[PDB]
Amino acid sequence: MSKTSGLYTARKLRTVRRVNRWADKKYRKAHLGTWLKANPLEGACMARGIVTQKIGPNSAVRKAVRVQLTKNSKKITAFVPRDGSITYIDNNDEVLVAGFGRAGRAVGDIPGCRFKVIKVAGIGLLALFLRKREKRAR
Amino acid sequence: GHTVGFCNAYQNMDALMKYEPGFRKIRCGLIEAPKPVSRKQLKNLKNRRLKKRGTEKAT
Amino acid sequence: TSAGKVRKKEKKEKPRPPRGRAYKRLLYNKNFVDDTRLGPNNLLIRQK
Amino acid sequence: PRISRHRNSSKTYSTPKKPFTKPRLDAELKLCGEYGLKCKREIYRARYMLAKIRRTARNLLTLDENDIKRRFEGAALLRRLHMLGILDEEKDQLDYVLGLRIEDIFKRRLQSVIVESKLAKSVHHARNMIKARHISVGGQIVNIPSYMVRISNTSRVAIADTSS
RNA sequence: CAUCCGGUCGAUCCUGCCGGAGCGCGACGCUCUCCCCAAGGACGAAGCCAUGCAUGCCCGCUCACCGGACGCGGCGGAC
RNA sequence: GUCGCGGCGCGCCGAGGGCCCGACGCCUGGCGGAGAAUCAGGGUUCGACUCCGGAGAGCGGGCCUGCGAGACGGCCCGCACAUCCAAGGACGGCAGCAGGCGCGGAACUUGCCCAAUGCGCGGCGCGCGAGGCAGCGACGGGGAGCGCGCGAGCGAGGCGGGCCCACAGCCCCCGCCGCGGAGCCGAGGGCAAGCUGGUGCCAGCAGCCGCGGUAAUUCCAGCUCGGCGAGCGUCGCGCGGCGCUGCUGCAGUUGAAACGCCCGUAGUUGGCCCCCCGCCGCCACGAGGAAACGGGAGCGCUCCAGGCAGGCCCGUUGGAC
Ligand SMILES: [Mg+2]
Ligand SMILES: [Mg+2]
Ligand SMILES: [Mg+2]
Ligand SMILES: [Mg+2]
Ligand SMILES: [Mg+2]
Ligand SMILES: [Mg+2]
Ligand SMILES: [Mg+2]
Ligand SMILES: [Mg+2]
């Protein structure tokens, strides 16, 4: 047929699979290493940085912030989910930033955003949104 | 309803004294328990004594 | 202009629904033994 | 290291692959009502045990009747089932096992066995009394509703002597 | 313990991928009535260390003090 | 020379050895195995950590003692750090147990004891941060509950007595009095679950499709409802989904994809035929070789996760395989 099938052909099948498994995009991304070096989070679930600038077919301006990772010193952009949560974020403040649902790719209509703010000054953003915790220490 | 355990009957009183863990005797009404001493202080004394030379009985 | 511009009825103080299995027993009779159309206006009209 | 590291442990239930399924929800609520189940973990436990029995029966059935291992394991399994009351006494062939159902497992719970004896008004009443240690098996009192009674112990179940 | 579902069109059949549905390992958030078991500074810092402890025992050798100190000697410290 | 064979080292001689059945070189966020996660079958990923084996004690070297060490809670040197100094001098190695700084998304008491298991030295014992007990501990696993019914009863909790304990707890038992407390997500579809008031492509939701420009079934709130439940949700990774890596089991006219054609080595594949001999593969059985994990026989820790037990007249009780 179109595949080798002899009784003494294990080596050829092994090398064929070895060579051809590299054509899958996901497998390359996972086991090539370029993504690992390029990813700012360096394979971590979430990282810690410092705020430095608050910035902005659906036509809805979105609020985000620029962050500088402490452990890596590079710059990224993060988005503030809830309604009216930008006020809780002040310039030059420490934040904890995680990823979106999709690992790497952008989510939704936000252009070039792949990170999320979840904790500010050591207090959960969602908790502050519901008034469970308060920022009177800051 | 049910309670089970173990006993130990000795032929003579002396045999009990020779063959018996000390804490068992203390639990029983046989002898008197010396006041406890912290092993930490004992180790401190041992190290301090090892520090000295010749006759180290002063401390 | 101010962010959160978009951002009160007295709470209906009623006995708490039972917890544990007793809650499970409530639904069993709610859907079979008791007359029900689940969630339409007319059902809510009747209960008032 | 600590001796506690060598202790074993395992889970005891399986969760459905498809959570939202109307017939399944209806059947599970139905069973919970008839047998007064506290939550949906008991059903998963019953399914786990049934799956284990079914897999053992399958593996044994795949072999020839006159196989030493087949005889050994089938005899053990049948003896266990008969002792536990899940399977009827008159059934001795391995085929009958594969048709079993979790209702059979449920019917041997302590609440059920005391209710069928008329000693309790309902499964919920049975659970309430069991939690209050008012029942006894043989000479001992059991306060676990899920306790499973054996066939030889069914007639020895009574009310606790010390119960008020 | 052999399962699929939504998205290209004015409608239809395919290829093809995107997303959802399950389990496990960790971190974050909210919350927590009772009992049993139970891991716990490993994750490109094998980076830096106040403070205390982690290796002793005794048959041989007593003109020490009132035989017990200490010391020489022996075994162990390479587990 | 070594305990000892050996290019292990030295002198002489000759030239060889390895490689597409992949040498040499480079890289690794490379300790290995027994094993762990996942689940028709076939497989994929991981394997710091409990048992075994290996290596190391800041980096690089050297050495004495001793049967046994290239030892580091042994010594000497260089390098990098660090401490006291009455300035001439002296002195250190927590990847041991607690504890501290730095780092990070991430990780516990500077506690008690040798009573159990063992080791060392020994006659009626000493020592052991090995180890054991306790403390913090929503990593995680298992078992009960916030009612039943027309009156009673029962927990949690409190106060005393036992039992246990090296001493203290905790569990369990006996008396008196007696707090019943549910959250996290969502209601357009995938996917189970619908009415009022605000806002007006703004604010915001939305993993994907999409909503929002005057009824918004999707934003913000109230009511009601749904799922799991002492737990629920979010982020990253692995398996599955996926017959989208295909040995079982993909596709190649037009969707992505048959080298422009021929010869040809390595490689792979090769018609039929002899009944009994030899060899290779193959099938079956067997010997030998650690357990733990996994499977599995038996046993009512009140059940269970577990563990190897218990009553009596016990297979020689058992711990089979
Ligand atoms: Mg390495
Ligand atoms: Mg080892
Ligand atoms: Mg070494
Ligand atoms: Mg050394
Ligand atoms: Mg050492
Ligand atoms: Mg050290
Ligand atoms: Mg074309
Ligand atoms: Mg084409």
Per the CB < 8 A criterion, the answer to whether D35 and D112 are in contact is yes
User: Is C21 buried (19+), middle (13-18) or exposed (0-12) by CB count in 10 A?
Assistant: middle
- Residue reference for tokens 């159902």: D101
- The boundaries of the domain holding residue A95 are 1-137
In three-state secondary structure terms, D101 is coil
- The number of CA neighbours under 13 Å toward the Cβ of D111 is 21
Q: How far is the CA of A22 from the centre of ligand 7 (A)?
A: 26
Residue D6 lies inside a defined structural domain of this protein: no
DSSP 8-state secondary structure symbol assigned to residue C10? -
Bases of chain E within 7 A of a CB of the protein: 1, 3, 18-24, 26-31, 37-40, 44, 52-54, 56, 69-71
Chain C residues close to A83, C-beta within 8 Å: 4, 6-7
Number of domains present in the structure of chain D: 1
Taking alpha carbons only, the member of A115, A116, A117, A92 closest to residue A104 is A115
- The boundaries of the domain holding residue D115 are 19-164
**C-beta contacts of D148-152 below 8 A and 24+ residues apart:** D148/D84, D148/D108, D148/D109, D148/D110, D149/D85, D149/D108, D149/D110, D149/D113, D150/D83, D150/D84, D150/D85, D151/D82, D151/D83, D151/D84, D151/D85, D152/D83
Residue type, A17: R
Structure tokens at D21: 């399924």
How was this one solved?
cryo-EM
Cα A78 to Cα A98: distance, rounded to the nearest angstrom? 9
Neighbours of D34 (CB within 10 A): 13
Resolution, angstroms, 1 dp: 3.2
DSSP 8-state secondary structure symbol assigned to residue D83? H
Task: Give the total residue count for chain D.
Answer: 164
Cα A121 to Cα A99: distance, rounded to the nearest angstrom? 18
**Helical packing angle, C21-28 and D123-131, nearest 10°:** 170
- The number of CA neighbours under 13 Å toward the Cβ of B52 is 11
Neighbours of B11 (CB within 10 A): 7
Structure tokens at C29: 């009779």
- The number of CA neighbours under 13 Å toward the Cβ of D73 is 17
Cα D164 to Cα D159: distance, rounded to the nearest angstrom? 10
Number of domains present in the structure of chain A: 1
Residue D12 lies inside a defined structural domain of this protein: no
Per the CB < 8 A criterion, the answer to whether D107 and D115 are in contact is no
